[PDB]
Amino acid sequence: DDVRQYVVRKPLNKEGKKPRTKAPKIQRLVTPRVLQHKRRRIALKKQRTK
RNA sequence: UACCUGGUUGAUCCUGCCAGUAGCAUAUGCUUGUCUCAAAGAUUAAGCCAUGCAUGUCUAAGUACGCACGGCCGGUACAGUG
Ligand SMILES: [Mg+2]
Ligand SMILES: [Mg+2]
Ligand SMILES: [Mg+2]
Ligand SMILES: [Mg+2]
Ligand SMILES: [Mg+2]
Ligand SMILES: [Mg+2]
Ligand SMILES: [Mg+2]
């Protein structure tokens, strides 16, 4: 499942301001940047060995 | 600038100190127009202290769900300022 679809967003409703909703930033979320960082670490290991 | 002068005797020559002489540091007195530097609660009490200040700090890059602002789109997990 996709955890991005179940984030509980709090409805922000202030007088005089356009009503809307807010969501937190998911932590410990596997993202392409995390995988790329892991790949780079492994690549550095390979370079050191070579 | 490698310097002396007054004072013991009726007078002399000595010894010898007292006093004078110049600088330098602290204080103090009288006086003081310009201008450049500039010391400054050490000495007595490392005695006692009202009050205020004297040490804080965020980048692109640890943690943002404060609408505190501001969205752009509005379910686009997380825009940005913070
Ligand atoms: Mg005699
Ligand atoms: Mg005489
Ligand atoms: Mg003398
Ligand atoms: Mg004199
Ligand atoms: Mg003047
Ligand atoms: Mg002092
Ligand atoms: Mg003192």
Q: Is A16 left (phi over 0), alpha (psi -120 to 50) or beta?
A: left
Closest nt by CA–C1' to A17 = B67
How determined? Answer: cryo-EM
Q: Rounded to whole angstroms, what are the CA distances from A43 to A17, A32, A35, A50?
A: 50, 16, 12, 11
Please answer whether residues A13 and A19 qualify as being in contact, where contact means their C-beta atoms are separated by less than 8 angstroms.
yes
Nucleic chain B: which protein residues 4-43 of A have CB below 7 A from it?
Answer: 4-5, 7-10, 12-14, 17-27, 29, 31
Resolution (Å units): 2.6
- Report how far residue A28's alpha carbon sits from residue A41's, in angstroms, rounded to the nearest whole number: 18
Give the end-to-end CA distance of chain A in Å, rounded to a whole number: 40
Which tokens belong to A20? Answer: 């809307």
- Report how far residue A39's alpha carbon sits from residue A50's, in angstroms, rounded to the nearest whole number: 17
CA A11 to C1' B50, whole Å: 55
Please calculate the CA angle A4-A25-A7 and round it to the nearest 5 degrees.
35
